[PDB]
Design a protein around this ligand. Structure first.
Ligand SMILES: OC[C@H]1O[C@@H](O[C@H]2[C@H](O)[C@@H](O)[C@H](O)O[C@@H]2CO)[C@H](O)[C@@H](O)[C@@H]1O
Ligand SMILES: [Ca+2]
Length: 161
């Protein structure tokens, strides 16, 4: 594996919020394990746990990203997306965002979200590439409670192809 996070050491590492939401490594909740990363206090669909992965990866390569997700409150089902945040030429004012995978989860059950992704080449000037999880986009005025449910992620992995 190029990158692995199972949270079993209880460390947040380099995982971060995207806005005003709360990240916590919790104990007693996990995918076949005792620990996982909970994201709560979400008030936008795009709030979710994020980590910078570009340093783990070769520019120009194709890699396989997977993670497990779960939520246990609110609707019977809900879509979780796996997405990328990209920065070019250290321009923090013009980030790009792309979804790489999406699954419909059932309340209370862990499910795997995965895809191949392309790491842009050096000659793009790519300077950040961060994986994150989120719910499907909605404008702030249309956002409802079901959209902003807390959720867990675990067993994050990036593999060579
Ligand atoms: O709708 C496009 C895109 O928005 C991304 O969220 C941005 C938000 O649009 C921006 O105004 C705010 O200041 O920062 C956040 C990111 O933390 C969102 O991440 C994408 O899922 C969405 O496709
Ligand atoms: Ca775990």
């Amino acid at each position: 594996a190029l990158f692995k996070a199972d949270f079993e050491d209880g460390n947040i590492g380099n995982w971060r919020a995207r806005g005003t939401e709360k990240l916590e490594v919790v104990s007693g909740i996990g995918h076949n394990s005792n620990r996982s990363l909970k994201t709560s206090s979400r008030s936008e669909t795009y709030h979710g746990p994020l980590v910078e992965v570009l340093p783990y990866l070769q520019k120009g390569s194709t890699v396989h990203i997977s993670f497990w997700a779960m939520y246990d409150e609110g609707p019977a089902t809900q879509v979780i997306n796996g997405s990328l945040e990209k920065e070019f030429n250290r321009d923090t004012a013009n980030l790009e965002y792309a979804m790489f995978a999406s699954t419909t989860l059932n309340k209370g059950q862990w499910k795997k979200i995965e895809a191949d992704i392309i790491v842009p080449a050096e000659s793009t000037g790519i300077s950040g590439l961060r994986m994150y999880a989120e719910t499907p986009w909605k404008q702030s005025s249309e956002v409802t409670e079901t959209d902003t449910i807390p959720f867990y992620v675990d067993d994050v992995q990036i593999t060579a192809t």
